[PDB]
Write a protein that binds this ligand. Structure first.
Ligand code: SF4
Length: 60
């Protein structure tokens, strides 16, 4: 549900870390990309309609 990550798109907003620490989180450089690849958790279903950078792409 999130194999293609979009970095240049992400805009350090804070819509993933809140979602779920499994795949939706952040780093120290600020860039908020994907941490988990095949995030199967139930929090990325909504992450699709949440993350404004639609960076967690489902290439599942
Ligand atoms: S929710 Fe999406 S746009 Fe917001 S910080 Fe996380 S990855 Fe970046």
């Amino acid at each position: 549900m999130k194999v293609r990550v979009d970095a240049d798109a992400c805009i350090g907003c804070g819509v993933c870390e809140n979602l779920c620490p499994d795949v939706f989180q952040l780093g120290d450089d600020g860039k908020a990309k994907v941490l988990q690849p095949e995030t199967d958790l139930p929090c990325a279903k909504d992450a699709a309609d949440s993350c404004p950078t639609g960076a967690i792409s489902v290439e599942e």
